[PDB]
Design a protein around this nucleic acid. Structure first.
Ligand code: HPA
Ligand code: HPA
Lengths: 338, 338
DNA sequence: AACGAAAATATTTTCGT
DNA sequence: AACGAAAATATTTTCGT
């Protein structure tokens, strides 16, 4: 069809291309004629044909876990922006932590020739780290690891440990000592890593967390609902609680309220993520903020680099969580004593 | 590179293709040899080259508004599923209700030759309905209209009017008569249309809604926060409130609580959407449920049809909202009197 | 019976003059 | 000075025998 435009403008295709891409000088009239034909015929250059020759689709892929979760959704939407303001088109794929699903997507992606790969899989078993190496060619960056798990990728690091620690400290400094904790999957950095940062602070404070007080969650509100229930559904209960993620916390709040508890008069609760609608939780949620836009942009920007400037060496950039004081934490029994 | 595989297997490319696509019979050994070469070379067929010839990218596009909003996020994630379980790859693009942005995406999409187009733009000014016609060729379906706004598309209809009406009725039947309402943008079906369904029920009940009691929102929690504030920040206040969407409602709840109000002992609140985490709102949110998966799948399924079975005529399928009774609405002053 | 030669798909870019 | 001819990119598919 570039033919059809060309013969209607009475010029070569080679010319038609040139005016379209401003790849070289074309006479005014000539350039106008082409436009005219271009308009009449109603022409839309084939991006596929072109990519075939230029060798790049100007389109990147997202091998994600899930897209509904607040945490996720925000990151992605940020990524989309960056892609768009820089020409890239975005292919989104959710693996659901399912190997086959991830193997399939990884393939469709390579075949559809994505220019780069944005990886957010949550849990990375060896089998997965393997598949990834098989694609060490297509440039990529994992955005959800605690450290550099490999050498064939660029990685961005959230410092979820120094966050957990920050969370613990606050509680401590608020006068708390009987603290419980509902963490997210341990096979996750955002789970196991935040937890540990937490426990460190606990140890330096000589605080012990009774195991009847640590309840695993899956980051979904329902899980936090059941964890809170268990923690308070017992003889001795803590005076404060550290929740792995905001959306689980929102589920902790519910149960608390459902059992006549008052947060934070009865129980203080601190979460982690700082989701967009956190402030509108009842009460406004005190939590640890994860820079999600900066995560998105910073990842997209690493990929581009490697992409354009053909970099080959691994790169890892750190990002930092920070505390956000809202209205869900109350002073503790030992506050005055410090 | 299909060449490289072929000459290593000592067979034509034509053969290499055939075994790959099982497009025709190949001898066992021959088929195995090809596989072998295929494996050694580490070959990934070029989906672009192929699409060039077959004329279809086996990939559809989402011209969305935003992707973070709960309402949206859910629909999309549902769409992704359908795409994936049927071979399609998903290109997501958020227009942000920005014409240029929408014009740009619409183009990149046509150029990148999407096989079909899923449209969710929220507000459709004439200028936009126009651009859309310019692409009446590429098969598409709008999923967010109240009726069939045009003839060059398939449409799925939510019946947001019969929902608003349902919402009103409940309140009425609960013993309420002093009701306020924070609706979503009127330029939206989910805004203007739910509102009207509401007001109808109000009229048949001879209830008048004092204008100091109707406050527009933008579907974002913050807006609901300010609307509730205004409604209750006044002399005479209603005994119940109908909120256009759940996430705004969650913002209504906050303010209510912030002003010492008790939902629903003080104010009953009913929303619309039935988002995944609605039940974990404090209190568990009574709302009108919008079948979002069914929306996604049903749209994807219309598109496919038109796609494969080369249909040309418009099609419109209706979907139905339904009431979900939770714990945010209390009996009203006139309950006993009916 | 099982396979190949070559045309085709819609572009870009190299040398031309 | 301003433009074109033709090779190339990585596949599928038509007739062959
Ligand atoms: O895996 C996760 N899911 C949801 N929210 C989260 N916040 C941190 N990690 C996660
Ligand atoms: O446009 C919308 N945005 C967010 N939530 C919604 N629920 C219905 N319509 C909308």
């Amino acid at each position: 069809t570039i033919k059809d435009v060309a013969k209607r403008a009475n010029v070569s295709t080679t010319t038609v291309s040139h005016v379209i891409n401003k790849t070289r000088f074309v006479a005014e009239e000539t350039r106008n004629a082409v436009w005219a034909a271009i308009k009449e015929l109603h022409y839309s250059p084939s991006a596929v044909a072109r990519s075939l020759k230029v060798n790049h689709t100007k389109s990147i892929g997202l091998l994600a876990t899930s897209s509904e979760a607040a945490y996720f959704a925000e990151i992605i939407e940020a990524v989309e922006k960056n892609c768009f303001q820089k020409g890239y088109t975005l292919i989104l794929g959710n693996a659901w932590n399912n190997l086959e699903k991830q193997r399939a997507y990884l393939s469709m992606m390579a075949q559809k020739r994505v220019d780069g790969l944005l990886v957010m899989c949550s849990e990375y078993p060896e089998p997965l780290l393997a598949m990834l190496e098989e694609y060490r060619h297509i440039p990529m960056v994992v955005m959800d690891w605690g450290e550099a798990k490999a050498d064939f990728t660029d990685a961005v690091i959230d410092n979820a440990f120094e966050g957990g620690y920050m969370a613990g400290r606050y509680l401590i400094e608020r006068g708390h000592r009987e603290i419980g904790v509902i963490p997210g999957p341990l096979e996750r950095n955002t789970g196991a890593g935040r937890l540990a940062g937490f426990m460190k602070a606990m140890e330096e404070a000589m605080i012990k967390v009774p195991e009847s007080w640590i309840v695993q969650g899956d980051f979904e509100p329902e899980s936090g609902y059941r964890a809170m229930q268990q923690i308070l559904s017992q003889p001795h209960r803590p005076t404060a609680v550290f929740c792995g993620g905001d959306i689980m916390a929102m589920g902790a709040l519910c149960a608390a309220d459902e059992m006549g508890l008052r947060v934070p008069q009865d129980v203080s609760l601190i979460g982690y993520d700082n989701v967009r609608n956190a402030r509108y939780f009842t009460p406004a949620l005190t939590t640890i903020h994860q820079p999600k836009d900066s995560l998105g942009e910073t990842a997209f920007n690493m990929l581009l680099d490697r992409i354009v400037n053909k970099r080959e060496e691994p790169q890892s950039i750190e990002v930092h969580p920070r505390l956000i004081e809202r209205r869900s934490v109350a002073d503790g029994p030992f506050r005055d004593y410090r």
